[PDB]
Design an enzyme around this catalytic site. Structure first.
Site, PDB file in Angstrom:
ATOM      1  N   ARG A   1      67.351 -79.871 -69.918  1.00 21.03           N
ATOM      2  CA  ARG A   1      67.791 -80.962 -70.762  1.00 21.03           C
ATOM      3  C   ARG A   1      68.647 -80.406 -71.902  1.00 21.03           C
ATOM      4  O   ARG A   1      69.421 -81.150 -72.509  1.00 21.03           O
ATOM      5  CB  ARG A   1      66.573 -81.741 -71.265  1.00 21.03           C
ATOM      6  CG  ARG A   1      65.913 -81.146 -72.503  1.00 21.03           C
ATOM      7  CD  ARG A   1      64.674 -81.887 -72.969  1.00 21.03           C
ATOM      8  NE  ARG A   1      63.484 -81.238 -72.433  1.00 21.03           N
ATOM      9  CZ  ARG A   1      62.811 -80.270 -73.043  1.00 21.03           C
ATOM     10  NH1 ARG A   1      63.194 -79.852 -74.238  1.00 21.03           N
ATOM     11  NH2 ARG A   1      61.758 -79.732 -72.457  1.00 21.03           N
ATOM     12  N   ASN A   2      68.498 -79.099 -72.169  1.00 20.86           N
ATOM     13  CA  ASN A   2      69.168 -78.419 -73.265  1.00 20.86           C
ATOM     14  C   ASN A   2      70.221 -77.452 -72.731  1.00 20.86           C
ATOM     15  O   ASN A   2      70.643 -76.539 -73.440  1.00 20.86           O
ATOM     16  CB  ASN A   2      68.177 -77.682 -74.170  1.00 20.86           C
ATOM     17  CG  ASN A   2      67.298 -78.611 -74.978  1.00 20.86           C
ATOM     18  OD1 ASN A   2      67.614 -79.789 -75.158  1.00 20.86           O
ATOM     19  ND2 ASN A   2      66.193 -78.082 -75.471  1.00 20.86           N
TER      20      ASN A   2
ATOM     21  N   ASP B   1      71.520 -76.772 -77.787  1.00 21.25           N
ATOM     22  CA  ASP B   1      70.415 -77.250 -78.605  1.00 21.25           C
ATOM     23  C   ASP B   1      69.688 -76.073 -79.254  1.00 21.25           C
ATOM     24  O   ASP B   1      68.677 -75.601 -78.735  1.00 21.25           O
ATOM     25  CB  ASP B   1      69.515 -78.219 -77.834  1.00 21.25           C
ATOM     26  CG  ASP B   1      68.452 -78.897 -78.686  1.00 21.25           C
ATOM     27  OD1 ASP B   1      68.266 -78.478 -79.852  1.00 21.25           O
ATOM     28  OD2 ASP B   1      67.809 -79.844 -78.170  1.00 21.25           O
TER      29      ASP B   1
ATOM     30  N   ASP C   1      63.219 -73.494 -77.034  1.00 23.16           N
ATOM     31  CA  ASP C   1      63.246 -74.780 -76.349  1.00 23.16           C
ATOM     32  C   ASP C   1      64.181 -74.721 -75.139  1.00 23.16           C
ATOM     33  O   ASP C   1      65.008 -75.605 -74.940  1.00 23.16           O
ATOM     34  CB  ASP C   1      63.553 -75.936 -77.308  1.00 23.16           C
ATOM     35  CG  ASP C   1      63.337 -77.323 -76.712  1.00 23.16           C
ATOM     36  OD1 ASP C   1      62.866 -77.409 -75.554  1.00 23.16           O
ATOM     37  OD2 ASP C   1      63.656 -78.315 -77.394  1.00 23.16           O
TER      38      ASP C   1
HETATM   39  C1  LIG Z   1      69.971 -86.304 -73.529  1.00 22.74           C
HETATM   40  C2  LIG Z   1      71.450 -86.236 -73.136  1.00 22.74           C
HETATM   41  C3  LIG Z   1      72.462 -86.344 -74.341  1.00 22.74           C
HETATM   42  O1  LIG Z   1      72.118 -86.596 -75.508  1.00 22.74           O
HETATM   43  N1  LIG Z   1      73.745 -86.123 -73.973  1.00 22.74           N
HETATM   44  C4  LIG Z   1      74.149 -85.827 -72.559  1.00 22.74           C
HETATM   45  C5  LIG Z   1      75.354 -84.944 -72.686  1.00 22.74           C
HETATM   46  C6  LIG Z   1      76.003 -85.370 -73.983  1.00 22.74           C
HETATM   47  N2  LIG Z   1      76.485 -84.159 -74.679  1.00 22.74           N
HETATM   48  N3  LIG Z   1      75.884 -83.507 -75.679  1.00 22.74           N
HETATM   49  C7  LIG Z   1      76.675 -82.495 -75.984  1.00 22.74           C
HETATM   50  C8  LIG Z   1      76.375 -81.603 -76.989  1.00 22.74           C
HETATM   51  C9  LIG Z   1      76.137 -80.908 -77.779  1.00 22.74           C
HETATM   52  C10 LIG Z   1      75.817 -79.970 -78.810  1.00 22.74           C
HETATM   53  C11 LIG Z   1      75.113 -78.823 -78.426  1.00 22.74           C
HETATM   54  C12 LIG Z   1      74.761 -77.862 -79.367  1.00 22.74           C
HETATM   55  O2  LIG Z   1      74.075 -76.759 -78.943  1.00 22.74           O
HETATM   56  C13 LIG Z   1      73.832 -75.747 -79.921  1.00 22.74           C
HETATM   57  C14 LIG Z   1      75.142 -78.069 -80.705  1.00 22.74           C
HETATM   58  C15 LIG Z   1      75.846 -79.218 -81.094  1.00 22.74           C
HETATM   59  O3  LIG Z   1      76.189 -79.411 -82.395  1.00 22.74           O
HETATM   60  C16 LIG Z   1      75.466 -78.545 -83.277  1.00 22.74           C
HETATM   61  C17 LIG Z   1      76.191 -80.175 -80.142  1.00 22.74           C
HETATM   62  C18 LIG Z   1      77.749 -82.481 -75.190  1.00 22.74           C
HETATM   63  C19 LIG Z   1      78.819 -81.682 -75.076  1.00 22.74           C
HETATM   64  N4  LIG Z   1      78.915 -80.642 -75.899  1.00 22.74           N
HETATM   65  N5  LIG Z   1      79.770 -81.907 -74.164  1.00 22.74           N
HETATM   66  C20 LIG Z   1      79.644 -83.002 -73.325  1.00 22.74           C
HETATM   67  N6  LIG Z   1      78.531 -83.809 -73.452  1.00 22.74           N
HETATM   68  C21 LIG Z   1      77.617 -83.532 -74.381  1.00 22.74           C
HETATM   69  C22 LIG Z   1      74.950 -86.135 -74.796  1.00 22.74           C
END
Ligand SMILES: */C=C/C(=O)N1CC[C@H](n2nc(C#Cc3cc(OC)cc(OC)c3)c3c(N)ncnc32)C1
Length: 298
Positions: free
Chosen positions: A164-165, A178, A160
């Site tokens: 976006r990821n 992701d 994926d």
């Molecule tokens: C569609 C956009 C969102 O949902 N976001 C925009 C940026 C925000 N955000 N998400 C994360 C994260 C994460 C994450 C990634 C990952 O990859 C394997 C695993 C996990 O837990 C298993 C979490 C972040 C981060 N990390 N920093 C700042 N903003 C983030 C939400």
């Protein structure tokens, strides 16, 4: 229900949750402060992100969050891969703690840096973002090629890869994220008799869609789409074409036109990544070497 992993475990009393960070791309994620998680500065209160189940969580959400954690554990640390910092697995809700990326995902990052007047353009904090140079986009491309080169060498298939990821830190470091659909394979192709179609169509290699097989060369295909996203500053692939009609078009041999921010050389790299025959696509190692040389000439 969760076996303790002492080397990863992080005490709950040290972790303070803050504001939700968006949701939609990476599940329910919140900002938090974790005292002593960063071994480099083991007294400092470092800003992190925490993924956790929602109140409306499903049974599969639980197992997925566990699988992403263990996937993160086994992948290892790299500059262009989002790092696992720790986890809370006992006496309370499951918290997976990850690196904080202040500038969000790549799509939104690029879209905020688009010229005023273009679709999806917006000034974060009502202040205009300094413009993406050509070097910036190639540097973004290179970092992501490095990340996938590492992933591939850990015998792992993302499945994926998209903008976006991808997460972006304060210092503009690209971080692949992701790992929801990510799998650890062998040398032969990933095949299962029981098909699920949870992969986004417009990023999937044809063999992924038609044969239901996945290799590292399928992630290359997706990298080509990621390149296209980068150089269109977060543009929607196959513009004006609905997902439904793309099944037919890929068989007919349709490919995306050249982004206007892109050079011929780079679009050729894109078009190579979009070769119908997987073993005719470059490897990530190859992609890195080329992107190195291109970036060097800028
Ligand atoms: C569609 C956009 C969102 O949902 N976001 C925009 C940026 C925000 N955000 N998400 C994360 C994260 C994460 C994450 C990634 C990952 O990859 C394997 C695993 C996990 O837990 C298993 C979490 C972040 C981060 N990390 N920093 C700042 N903003 C983030 C939400």
């Amino acid at each position: 229900e969760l076996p303790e992993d002492p080397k990863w475990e992080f005490p709950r009393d040290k972790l303070t949750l803050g504001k939700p960070l968006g949701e939609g791309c990476f599940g329910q994620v919140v900002m938090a402060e974790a005292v002593g998680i960063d071994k480099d500065k083991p007294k400092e209160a470092v800003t992190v992100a925490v993924k956790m189940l929602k109140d409306d969580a499903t049974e599969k959400d639980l197992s997925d969050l566990v699988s992403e954690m263990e996937m993160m554990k086994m992948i290892g640390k790299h500059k262009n891969i989002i790092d696992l910092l720790g986890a809370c697995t006992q006496d309370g809700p499951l918290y997976v703690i990850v690196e904080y990326a202040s500038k969000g995902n790549l799509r939104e990052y690029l879209r905020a840096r688009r010229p005023p007047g273009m679709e999806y353009s917006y000034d974060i904090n009502r202040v205009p973002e300094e413009q993406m140079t050509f070097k910036d986009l190639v540097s973004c491309t290179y970092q992501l090629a490095r990340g996938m080169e590492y992933l591939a060498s850990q015998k792992c298939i993302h499945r994926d890869l998209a903008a976006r990821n991808v997460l972006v830190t304060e210092n503009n470091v690209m971080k692949i994220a992701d790992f929801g659909l990510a799998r650890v394979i062998n040398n032969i192709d990933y095949y299962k008799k029981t098909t699920n179609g949870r992969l986004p169509v417009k990023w999937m290699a044809p063999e992924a869609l038609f044969d239901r097989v996945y290799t590292h060369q399928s992630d290359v295909w997706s990298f080509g789409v990621l390149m296209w996203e980068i150089f269109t500053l977060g543009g929607s692939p196959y513009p004006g074409i609905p997902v439904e009609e793309l099944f037919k078009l890929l068989k007919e041999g349709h490919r995306m036109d050249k982004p206007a921010n892109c050079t011929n050389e780079l679009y050729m790299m894109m078009r190579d990544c979009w070769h119908a025959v997987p073993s005719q696509r470059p490897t990530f190692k190859q992609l890195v070497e080329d992107l190195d040389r291109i970036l060097t000439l800028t």
